[PDB]
Structure 1
Amino acid sequence: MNITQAAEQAIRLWFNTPDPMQRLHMAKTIRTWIRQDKFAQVDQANMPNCVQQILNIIYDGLKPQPVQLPISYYAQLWYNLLDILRRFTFLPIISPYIHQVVQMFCPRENGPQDFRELICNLISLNWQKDPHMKHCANQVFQIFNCIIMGVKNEKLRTEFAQHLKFEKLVGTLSEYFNPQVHPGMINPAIFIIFRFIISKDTRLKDYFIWNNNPHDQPPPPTGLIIKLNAVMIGSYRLIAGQNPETLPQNPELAHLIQVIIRTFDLLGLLLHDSDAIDGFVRSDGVGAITTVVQYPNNDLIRAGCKLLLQVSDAKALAKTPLENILPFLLRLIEIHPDDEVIYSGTGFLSNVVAHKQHVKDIAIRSNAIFLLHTIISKYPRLDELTDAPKRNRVCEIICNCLRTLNNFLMMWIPTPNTKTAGPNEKQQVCKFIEIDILKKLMSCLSCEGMDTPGLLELRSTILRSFILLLRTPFVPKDGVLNVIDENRKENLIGHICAAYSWVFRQPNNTRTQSTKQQLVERTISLLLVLMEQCGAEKEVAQYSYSIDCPLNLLNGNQVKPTFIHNVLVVCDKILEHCPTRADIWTIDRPMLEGLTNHRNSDIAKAANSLLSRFPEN
């Protein structure tokens, strides 16, 4: 018998030859046949049947034989058969028939006899302790990895995913994340599988996390939140001493680093909503990451910070000890050369300080205000940035910083319902009215900055920053309007005006409408603040020739009472110093005469102050 004939007979005899040692001999032969031939001799139209025969031998070979046999034998039989299977999942010639491989996983008996439960049992952890069987495990992992990374037909992917969703498999996978397992034992393909089965399956996600427990209790020790955090920490304990210089010749170190990254990634995908995110935070996830990103590997730090950003809005972060974490993150932001980290950190910072007084207090005590100035100061103007990704990131970094600052400024501003700022806090805040940063922020308002998706939110946020700085008692107001940029030769008013005019040239879009409106409202609000706070009623009015009549802002369904009042007052103040605009503007006189009889006494009063300014005709 020659190769092909040796295979032919092997296939033919298989299902009538119950002899163990003949089956192994037989299996070795079919394998070597594939190994060499790469199927090219079999007739194309017989291929479905030829593949199906092999697959049925594979499936039959993996079944437990009635006689008592040594583990050593199965390991050898299975290695050959699983190797054929593996090859059936990457071999160009077989790919039209790949759905036949997937079909095999589809259950029939719902018991330990199905193909999938035989495959599943081979990657049980205890097999990694076995000197022979651990190689079959590593092959099954390559098989999953081949199917998952390989098949492009979306309907087939979906079916494969469905076939995998059974108790014994999810149990088997989780067992790798138990606290007593050394993380050296975690095959990387386990991540690949988890990503695959949870992809767009919310209920499975909540099952892994919660284990049918209530979402307000501690996440259970049997669930993944506790398991994955102990894996991060376990791996970190092992790499912590290790010199990162050894990396290129240190596969164990490389492995554990990638375990950490893949664990960050999995946690990212699992924590899909508020309750999941909160659970993570109450299980000390933030401390866990923060501890782990101490290790000087940049891929690791990026992935850690990405996950911190994702969890930064947790209300449970009001309860976590942040006295050590926050200073470390501030320090990391100060020194790390990567813009993705800067972005992630500052993003984390603004969310974490939001609505949390004691958290604001930690940030400020660790010089967060000085740091925000530094991060903003270090970047060039947006118009100096050529590549889009980079400019938009810088734009988001500045936005984050200014959002952080605004959260602080809010505390020292007198409300009807007064906190005092210390000597150091005052002078750090006052760095923001230095001429260079005013110039930078002014440029951001008015640069012919191109397609930058986060520009709208930056511009709205800068206006807010100016509003709060100028409403802040200890901030000097004398010099702000004397700052004239080198490029447009304009002061703050002109840049404010250029942004306002810009918002109206922008495309209409329900996604952005909310922010455009808040930018318009803040423009009006900042024009008033400048008028009152800088003693600049005249100059604000005359430097505002570039904007059309603000009254026309009320030509819609605008109900916000504070906005209406601001529009009316700013208009009246403008006509006090530039009377002729009253004849140049084109207003809805009925509407204005309407507002004279408004429920609000302030609106009604200002409306007929303004009406008196207009030509009777």
Structure 2
Amino acid sequence: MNITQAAEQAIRLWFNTPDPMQRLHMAKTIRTWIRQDKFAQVDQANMPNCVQQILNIIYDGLKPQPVQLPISYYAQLWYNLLDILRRFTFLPIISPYIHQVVQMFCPRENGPQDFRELICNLISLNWQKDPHMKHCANQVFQIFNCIIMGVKNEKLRTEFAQHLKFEKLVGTLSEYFNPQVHPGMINPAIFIIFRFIISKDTRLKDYFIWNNNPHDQPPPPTGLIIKLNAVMIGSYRLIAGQNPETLPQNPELAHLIQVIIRTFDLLGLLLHDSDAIDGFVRSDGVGAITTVVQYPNNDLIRAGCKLLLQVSDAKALAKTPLENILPFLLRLIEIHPDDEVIYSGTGFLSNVVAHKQHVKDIAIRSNAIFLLHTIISKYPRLDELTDAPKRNRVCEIICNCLRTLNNFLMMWIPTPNGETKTAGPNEKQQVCKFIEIDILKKLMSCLSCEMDTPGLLELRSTILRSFILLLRTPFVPKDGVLNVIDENRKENLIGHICAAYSWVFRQPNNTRTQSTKQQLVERTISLLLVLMEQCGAEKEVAQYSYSIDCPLNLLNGNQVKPTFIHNVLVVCDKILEHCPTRADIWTIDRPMLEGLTNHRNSDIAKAANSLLSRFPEN
């Protein structure tokens, strides 16, 4: 008897041969046949039921047999059947029939006799300490990995995902995240599966996090926030003293690092909204991340900082002790040579200081403002960066730094409300660095460089804001500012403001960017005003604004914002006081301006008729 004939006897006889020892022999036989022949002699049109026959035997073999048998026996039988099953999930010749594999997972009884429950039972954690069964477990993890990484058809993916969502399986997987389990026990496939069932299932995320408890309570110890945190930390504890130079020859260290990285990735997926990230922060997540990223490994650091970025807008960060975390993170941003880390860190900094005075104070005492100056200064002009991905990154980085700056400068600008804070000499020297000529040149060149970068619009809007706030800051010397001329365009700040303003009108019309374009326009008008007043340069601003067409035409739409209208009226009037002939050259909607003379607001009305008297009688 050859293998082909022996395998076919085995297949034909399986269901009427209940004897355990013969069943084992038959399984080896079928496996051997498959390993060797690879279905090549089987007619293509018969393949569907050839596969079904085998699948039906795999399933039957995994069922308990009433005769009591040693674990050694079952591990050997199942190892053979699971190895066949594994092969079905990667073998090219079987790939068109893979939906039959997936269909096996579909529940028929909704109980322990179902294929999915037998399978999921084989990856039970307590099997991992059994000498024979651990090998069956490892094989089932490979089967999950192969199907999840393998199947391309999206409807099939969706089906398989649904089959996996049952309490027994999520329970089983979660037991690997229990505090008492050594993290070396954690098969990476456990992450693949969690990622897979969680994907696009908002409520599954909430089931894992909250376990049906109130979103304002401390996240439950039965849920993933507490569990994933203890796994992060448990792994950190074991790698902490380990020299990273051993990595290439230290598989245990490699495995734990990878466990930490996939835990960061999984938490990233779980924390979908505000309630989740606030839960994470109340469970000391931010402290946990910052502790773990002390380990010198860049993938690990990149992944930790990515998650920090994601949770940075949490209101709970107003209650977290930041006296140690924040200086550590500033130090990291200062020395870490890779832009992704700088991007994440500065992004985090901008959100964490927002609306939180005591946090601003911590940052200032650790020289946060000085550091912003250093980060912006280290990069070339945006026009000197060739690769689009990297140019956009630098752009988002500078944008982060200036947004952080702007959250600081609020403190010190006179608010009628009565909270006029006084800057100390420490704050003063840090802030005043931002009017040094080198950074002014770089900032004005971002404003006017001529490239296709998605972040550019938001950057130019943020820069205008920075200048607005700097120039309204009492201790900032303003006398040198309009004397700074760039090497490239031979223009001063006014010329650069005017270039950004022109640029924005040539940009594509797109409801995504409309809001930001409007804010850039407003900030332009508002910055020209500030420059006029604060640098005593009313003449200079007006005559250096010949590049700008009649600002009054900005009001031709349904512009309802009262401060914008007033600004537009006032700037126009001040331009015509010094460049009288522009009144005859501009083309205005005169009846609209007359309308504004009788406006509810008295400031607007006063500006309107003052501006009206400038024009010909026509």
Q: TM-score, normalised by structure 1?
A: 1.00
Deviations 1:163-182 (A, max 9, x none): 00101000000000000000
What is the alpha-carbon distance in structure 1 between the residues aligned to residue 96 and residue 362 of structure 2? Answer: 61
Structure 1: tracts of 5 or more residues without a match: none
What is the alpha-carbon distance in structure 1 between the residues aligned to residue 157 and residue 388 of structure 2? Answer: 35
What is the alpha-carbon distance in structure 2 between the residues aligned to residue 219 and residue 557 of structure 1? Answer: 48
- Give 1:451 shift: 1.1
Alignment of 1:537-548 (within 5 A): 537-548=538-549
- Give 1:543 shift: 0.1
What is the alpha-carbon distance in structure 2 between the residues aligned to residue 108 and residue 8 of structure 1? Answer: 28
What is the alpha-carbon distance in structure 1 between the residues aligned to residue 325 and residue 34 of structure 2? Answer: 57
- Give 1:43 shift: 1.1
What is the alpha-carbon distance in structure 2 between the residues aligned to residue 289 and residue 553 of structure 1? Answer: 48
- Give 1:546 shift: 0.2
Deviations 1:467-509 (A, max 9, x none): 0000000000000000000000000000000000000000010
**Matched residue, 1:445:** 447
Deviations 1:166-201 (A, max 9, x none): 010000000000000000000000000000000000
What is the alpha-carbon distance in structure 2 between the residues aligned to residue 158 and residue 578 of structure 1? Answer: 68
- Give 1:245 shift: 0.1
What is the alpha-carbon distance in structure 2 between the residues aligned to residue 457 and residue 154 of structure 1? Answer: 36
Deviations 1:306-355 (A, max 9, x none): 00000000000001000000000000000000000000000000000011
**Matched residue, 2:494:** 493
**Matched residue, 1:571:** 572
- Give 1:139 shift: 0.3
**Matched residue, 2:170:** 170
What is the alpha-carbon distance in structure 1 between the residues aligned to residue 344 and residue 307 of structure 2? Answer: 9
**Matched residue, 1:350:** 350
Deviations 1:29-65 (A, max 9, x none): 1001000101001111111111000001000000000
- Give 1:538 shift: 0.1
What is the alpha-carbon distance in structure 1 between the residues aligned to residue 504 and residue 518 of structure 2? Answer: 9
Alignment of 1:505-524 (within 5 A): 505-524=506-525
- Give 1:424 shift: 1.3
Q: TM-score, normalised by structure 2?
A: 0.99
What is the alpha-carbon distance in structure 1 between the residues aligned to residue 139 and residue 31 of structure 2? Answer: 15
**Matched residue, 1:420:** 422
- Give 1:297 shift: 0.2
What is the alpha-carbon distance in structure 2 between the residues aligned to residue 47 and residue 385 of structure 1? Answer: 56
Deviations 1:557-610 (A, max 9, x none): 100000000000000000000000000000000000000000100000000000
What is the alpha-carbon distance in structure 2 between the residues aligned to residue 323 and residue 22 of structure 1? Answer: 70
What is the alpha-carbon distance in structure 1 between the residues aligned to residue 606 and residue 171 of structure 2? Answer: 71
Deviations 1:236-268 (A, max 9, x none): 000000000000000000000000000000000
- Give 1:215 shift: 0.7
**Matched residue, 1:232:** 232
What is the alpha-carbon distance in structure 1 between the residues aligned to residue 95 and residue 148 of structure 2? Answer: 13
- Give 1:84 shift: 0.2
SS in 1 for 2:53: helix
- Give 1:389 shift: 0.5
Deviations 1:108-141 (A, max 9, x none): 0010000000000000000001000000000000
Deviations 1:403-429 (A, max 9, x none): 000000011000010101000110110
SS in 2 for 1:407: helix
What is the alpha-carbon distance in structure 2 between the residues aligned to residue 309 and residue 49 of structure 1? Answer: 52
What is the alpha-carbon distance in structure 2 between the residues aligned to residue 135 and residue 182 of structure 1? Answer: 19
Give the superposed CA RMSD: 0.4
- Give 1:228 shift: 0.1
- Give 1:222 shift: 0.1
What is the alpha-carbon distance in structure 2 between the residues aligned to residue 49 and residue 406 of structure 1? Answer: 69
What is the alpha-carbon distance in structure 1 between the residues aligned to residue 45 and residue 396 of structure 2? Answer: 58
What is the alpha-carbon distance in structure 1 between the residues aligned to residue 300 and residue 40 of structure 2? Answer: 46
What is the alpha-carbon distance in structure 2 between the residues aligned to residue 278 and residue 514 of structure 1? Answer: 28
What is the alpha-carbon distance in structure 2 between the residues aligned to residue 549 and residue 279 of structure 1? Answer: 52
What is the alpha-carbon distance in structure 2 between the residues aligned to residue 494 and residue 371 of structure 1? Answer: 28
- Give 1:15 shift: 0.2
What is the alpha-carbon distance in structure 1 between the residues aligned to residue 250 and residue 385 of structure 2? Answer: 39
What is the alpha-carbon distance in structure 2 between the residues aligned to residue 356 and residue 589 of structure 1? Answer: 47
What is the alpha-carbon distance in structure 1 between the residues aligned to residue 34 and residue 285 of structure 2? Answer: 49
- Give 1:401 shift: 0.1
Deviations 1:213-239 (A, max 9, x none): 011101000000000000000000000
What is the alpha-carbon distance in structure 2 between the residues aligned to residue 434 and residue 242 of structure 1? Answer: 45
User: Which 4+ stretches in 1 moved above 4 angstroms?
Assistant: none
SS in 2 for 1:148: helix
